[PDB]
Amino acid sequence: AIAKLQSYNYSHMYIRNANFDVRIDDNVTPETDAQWVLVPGLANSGEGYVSIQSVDHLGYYLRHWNYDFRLEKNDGTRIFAEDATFKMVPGLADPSYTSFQSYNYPTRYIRHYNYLLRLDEIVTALDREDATFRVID
Incomplete structure (x- = not known):
C-alpha cells in the first residue's frame, strides 16, 4: 500500500526523502x-x-545504519533486510496510531529527533510521541 507517514505530535509534518537523506517536514x-x-x-x-x-526511488528503502537512517538501495543482503524491516505496532503514544519497532534491535523504534529520523531507545513520554505516526493510505 502507498501511504504517507504523519508525525503524531507535529501533525503537519511527514516522513520524507530529502535527496536520499530522511527527515520530517x-x-x-x-x-x-x-x-x-x-x-x-x-x-x-x-x-x-x-x-x-520510497515511491519516487523504487528499490530504495528506509534503512537504519546503527542509529541513523538513510534511503538506500537494497543490496540483497540479509543484513540490509534486517536493518530495513520493522514490526508495525500500536502507537507508543496512542495505540490507535502506529510505531515501527526495529527487527534486529527490538528495543529501538523509528523516531524523529527534531527534524531528523533516528532509531532510538524510547524512554520518555516525549520519546513515545516522537516515535508515533499516523499511517495515511
Missing part, C-alpha cells in the same frame, strides 16, 4: 517525497513486519 515538495510503499518485511514475511519503500 511540512509542505513537502515534490509530494512523492512523502509517499511510501509499505511492503512485506524484507527480513521476515510474518504478520506485522514491513519495509518502507
Whole structure:
C-alpha cells in the first residue's frame, strides 16, 4: 500500500526523502517525497513486519545504519533486510496510531529527533510521541 507517514505530535509534518537523506517536514515538495510503499518485511514475511519503500526511488528503502537512517538501495543482503524491516505496532503514544519497532534491535523504534529520523531507545513520554505516526493510505 502507498501511504504517507504523519508525525503524531507535529501533525503537519511527514516522513520524507530529502535527496536520499530522511527527515520530517511540512509542505513537502515534490509530494512523492512523502509517499511510501509499505511492503512485506524484507527480513521476515510474518504478520506485522514491513519495509518502507520510497515511491519516487523504487528499490530504495528506509534503512537504519546503527542509529541513523538513510534511503538506500537494497543490496540483497540479509543484513540490509534486517536493518530495513520493522514490526508495525500500536502507537507508543496512542495505540490507535502506529510505531515501527526495529527487527534486529527490538528495543529501538523509528523516531524523529527534531527534524531528523533516528532509531532510538524510547524512554520518555516525549520519546513515545516522537516515535508515533499516523499511517495515511
